[PDB]
Amino acid sequence: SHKEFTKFCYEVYNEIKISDKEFKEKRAALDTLRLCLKRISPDAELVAFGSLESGLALKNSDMDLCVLMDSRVQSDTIALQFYEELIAEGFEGKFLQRARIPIIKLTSDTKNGFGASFQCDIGFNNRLAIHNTLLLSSYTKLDARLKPMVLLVKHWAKRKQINSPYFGTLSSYGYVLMVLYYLIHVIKPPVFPNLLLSPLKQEKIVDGFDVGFDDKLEDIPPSQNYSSLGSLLHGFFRFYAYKFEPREKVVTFRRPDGYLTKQEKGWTRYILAIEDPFEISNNVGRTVSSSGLYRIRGEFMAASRLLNSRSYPIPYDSLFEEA
Ligand SMILES: Nc1ncnc2c1ncn2[C@@H]1O[C@H](COP(=O)(O)OP(=O)(O)OP(=O)(O)O)[C@@H](O)[C@H]1O
Ligand SMILES: [Mg+2]
Numbered sequence: 451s452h453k454e455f456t457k458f459c460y461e462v463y464n465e466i467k468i469s470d471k472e473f474k475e476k477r478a479a480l481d482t483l484r485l486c487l488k489r490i491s492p493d494a495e496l497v498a499f500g501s502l503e504s505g506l507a508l509k510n511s512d513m514d515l516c517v518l519m520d521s522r523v524q525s526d527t528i529a530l531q532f533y534e535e536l537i538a539e540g541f542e543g544k545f546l547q548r549a550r551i552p553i554i555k556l557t558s559d560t561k562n563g564f565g566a567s568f569q570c571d572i573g574f575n576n577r578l579a580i581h582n583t584l585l586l587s588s589y590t591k592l593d594a595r596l597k598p599m600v601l602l603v604k605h606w607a608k609r610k611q612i613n614s615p616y617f618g619t620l621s622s623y624g625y626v627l628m629v630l631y632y633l634i635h636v637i638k639p640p641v642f643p644n645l646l647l648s649p650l651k652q653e654k655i656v657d658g659f660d661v662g663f664d665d666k667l668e669d670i671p672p673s674q675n676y677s678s679l680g681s682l683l684h685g686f687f688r689f690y691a692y693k694f695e696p697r698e699k700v701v702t703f704r705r706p707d708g709y710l711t712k713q714e715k716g717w718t719r720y721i722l723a724i725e726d727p728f729e730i731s732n733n734v735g736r737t738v739s740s741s742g743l744y745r746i747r748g749e750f751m752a753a754s755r756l757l758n759s760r761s762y763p764i765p766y767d768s769l770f771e772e773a
Pocket of ligand 2: 501514
């Protein structure tokens with residue numbers, strides 16, 4: 451079956467998804483921050499990426515922003531200018547620089563009324579993030595099942611304490627890639643084609659990486675997989691519990707059969723290996739510690755055992771229970 455679980459998944463889905471109210475306020479916040487960027491640099495543009503842009507936003511979602519500008523004009527200079535205007539226009543935060551990369555983190559708003567805990571990361575010419583977002587965006591437009599499946603997984607990972615990059619587990623982005631990897635290269639029939647391996651894929655080099663994928667979405671045949679949201683979620687939890695091999699294998703979008711060893715890629719941290727689609731040198735699972743992996747796997751198994759329990763009624767609610 452999975453009929454009751456599907457029903458339940460849709461019920462939690464509507465409680466966790468960003469409302470139209472929060473969405474509209476986040477979009478007003480952006481209008482504001484753009485006015486501040488105009489007063490500093492007329493030519494620079496401010497773009498959003500991440501969950502809000504792709505449509506994979508939970509409630510209480512942080513904003514991920516990037517400033518695009520002429521690469522020849524140096525980004526440490528106008529970053530600071532932007533920071534000072536944000537401060538002056540009533541924003542609180544930090545101005546930072548890891549290596550050569552400048553970052554502003556806005557932590558609060560004291561005047562324009564976007565919250566006492568308004569959280570917002572601003573980068574400068576982080577072009578790859580935009581592209582990563584385009585990819586996730588396109589997939590979301592391709593199948594109506596993706597979006598609810600992702601937010602459920604994110605909610606799950608957050609609830610199970612397995613969604614902390616700084617504490618030895620995996621980022622949200624990392625979980626989205628695992629979802630996509632499952633939907634493309636594991637489930638049969640596949641729910642999604644691999645857009646990066648499309649015959650129609652035009653090459654586009656950005657910052658040294660090929661960010662090309664097939665974006666003419668309308669021309670793509672709909673999925674010949676007809677599984678319910680529940681079925682898919684069960685398949686997902688089953689695959690990473692029992693089938694997938696973290697020690698030998700890499701989650702990839704560069705192989706037509708999704709088959710990649712850690713060794714081919716030279717990834718002997720690499721406890722969990724997820725190859726970023728475009729920034730292929732970047733391992734998204736790099737934050738996953740040894741004990742982090744144990745917990746991540748333990749949760750994948752428990753989730754499978756639950757969904758497969760014979761003790762009726764199945765306490766589906768325990769799929770989302772704190773720690
Ligand atoms: N571990 C990572 N490695 C490389 N790039 C990342 C990583 N995590 C995030 N990013 C980039 O930053 C963006 C946002 O990161 P984040 O993990 O906040 O996900 P998100 O899409 O904002 O959703 P949420 O905010 O709910 O986690 C992504 O679009 C991605 O391009
Ligand atoms: Mg974010």
